[PDB]
């Protein structure tokens, strides 16, 4: 019996019947996590799908877009095993 699920599955390809195949990201493929900030100072976060990274790197560009749709400049991207410092609540680490 065909059981259905509601979610976000992307097509495998674009040629022949490959458009009709919907798949989920493989384990350990969410390697990039972009963090942008708008002029105001608010933070925006995104997870770049692997295919987007593949296309960008093929084009010689950076893995993560440097701006989001809203135009918030990219602060930086995180990948697994990356190290971050969390400032104290009182600390104001802008150019620490």
């Amino acid at each position: 019996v065909r059981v259905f699920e509601l979610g976000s599955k992307f097509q495998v390809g674009q040629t022949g019947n490959k458009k009709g195949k919907y798949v989920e990201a493989a384990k350990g493929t969410n390697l990039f996590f972009a963090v942008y900030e708008d002029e105001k100072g608010k933070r925006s976060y995104e997870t770049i799908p692997l295919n987007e990274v593949i296309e960008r790197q093929k084009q010689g560009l950076t893995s993560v877009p440097l701006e989001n749709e809203k135009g918030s400049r990219l602060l930086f991207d995180l990948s697994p095993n990356d190290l971050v410092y969390v400032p104290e609540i009182d600390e104001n680490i802008d150019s620490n």
Partner: protein
């Protein structure tokens, strides 16, 4: 059906009347509201102020005029420099021309109009240069 961009030379030939036929052709292009890259605008401003010595006020007014009614400026793409480095390995042009092509392609421009770019050449299978004045 195909996004069309222009280079500085088109607007220069429009601005120049020594060559009636070429000026006519360039003005004919402009009737189609062709897209354009901001670097084209800046280079146009420089050439206007250096070769023609036109006043800053008049040049600014004409720039505003054209950008408001005739043509459409293309927002600068933040991936212009990385792509230009990508294009440089496979392509040997002036870095200014490479930047213009980079921004045009990054904006999905399908045709670029210019003379001094080895007409008919295809840039990364995305944009074919067209020489209109021939």
């Amino acid at each position: 059906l195909d996004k069309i961009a222009i280079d500085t030379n088109i607007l220069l030939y429009a601005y120049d009347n020594r060559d009636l036929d070429k000026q006519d052709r360039a003005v004919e292009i402009l009737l189609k509201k062709p897209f354009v890259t901001q670097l084209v605008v800046f280079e146009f401003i420089k050439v206007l102020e250096r070769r023609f010595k036109m006043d800053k006020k008049e040049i600014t007014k004409l720039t505003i005029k054209l950008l408001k009614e005739v043509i459409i400026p293309l927002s600068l793409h933040r991936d212009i420099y990385n792509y230009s480095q990508f294009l440089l390995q496979r392509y040997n042009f002036g870095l200014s021309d490479i930047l213009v092509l980079s921004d045009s392609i990054l904006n999905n421009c399908t045709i670029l109009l210019s003379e001094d770019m080895c007409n008919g050449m295809i840039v990364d299978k995305k944009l074919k240069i067209v020489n209109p004045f021939l």
